[PDB]
């Protein structure tokens, strides 16, 4: 019930929005962890899909940690919620997982754009800069990469061609 000695120009609504973004980044980490181990199943067996999604999982945990750092740097207080189990699930094919990841990354981007419009509305240029520097271009690049992956799997003949997914695994994700 006392103010942080560091807190300055950091609105309560921005603090709460950062806590929601921390949960979403941890959720995205968990989705990619689930997708990774789907491709490690003996009846799927696409090792470079598995490595690609595990690396994406580890990168989302780093995104979450940087937002936790941000909350403390500005004198807000971290508030954690349960990390929901992955809600795309029933992964089906390399193409379907890539399509789920594209939808996930577009939903994360929309959250970040809402967060930026809140920080704009509260005239918080430090938070705006943080989001722009560390999150917005990384999301645009992630979305473009996943779109490229979905396109090549479609053009190659996935998901009906198991040869398509096999060769994509070796040539793009190797």
Binding of residue 126 to its own copies (CB under 8 A): yes
Distance of CA 156 to the CA centre of its chain: 26
132 is in an annotated binding site: no
- 94-113: contacts with its own copies (CB under 8 A): 102, 106, 109-110, 113
Distances (CA, A) of 18 to 59, 63, 115, 122, 137: 18, 12, 8, 14, 18
Within 1-60, the residues that bind Mg ion by CB under 5 A are: 23-25, 56, 59-60
Out of 86, 96, 97, 111, name the contact with its own copies by CB under 8 A.
86
**Can residue 18 be called a binding residue for its own copies (CB under 8 A)?**
no
Looking at the Cβ atoms of 13 and 160, the one nearer to its own copies is 160
Any known ligand binding at 63? Answer: yes
> Is the separation of the CB atoms in 142 and 33 below 8 Å?
no
d(CA 150, CA 153): 5
Give the HSE-up count for residue 147: Cα atoms under 13 Å, Cβ half-sphere: 8
Could you tell me which of 98, 126, 132 has the C-alpha nearest to residue 112? 132
Contact status: 63 vs Mg ion (CB under 5 A): yes
The annotation status of 114 as a binding-site residue, yes or no, is no
Q: Which one of residues 11, 20, 54, 59 is an interface residue with its own copies (CB under 8 A)?
A: 54
Q: What does the binding site for Cl ion look like in residue numbers (CB under 5 A)?
A: 16, 19, 79, 81-82
Known binding-site residue numbers for Fe cation: 25, 60, 63, 105, 139
């Amino acid at each position: 019930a006392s103010t942080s000695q560091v807190r300055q120009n950091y609105h309560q609504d921005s603090e709460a929005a950062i806590n929601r973004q921390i949960n979403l980044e941890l959720y995205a980490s968990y989705v990619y962890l689930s997708m990774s181990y789907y491709f490690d199943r003996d009846d799927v067996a696409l090792k470079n899909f598995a490595k690609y999604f595990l690396h994406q999982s580890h990168e989302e945990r780093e995104h979450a940690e940087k937002l936790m750092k941000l909350q403390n740097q500005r004198g807000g207080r971290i508030f954690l919620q349960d990390i929901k189990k992955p809600d795309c699930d029933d992964w089906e094919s390399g193409l379907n997982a890539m399509e789920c990841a594209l939808h996930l990354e577009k939903n994360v981007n929309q959250s970040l754009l809402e967060l930026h419009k809140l920080a704009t509305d509260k005239n918080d240029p430090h938070l705006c800069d943080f989001i722009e520097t560390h999150y917005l271009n990384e999301q645009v690049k992630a979305i473009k990469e996943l779109g490229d992956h979905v396109t090549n799997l479609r053009k190659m003949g996935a998901p009906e061609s198991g040869l398509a997914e096999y060769l994509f695994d070796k040539h793009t994700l190797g």
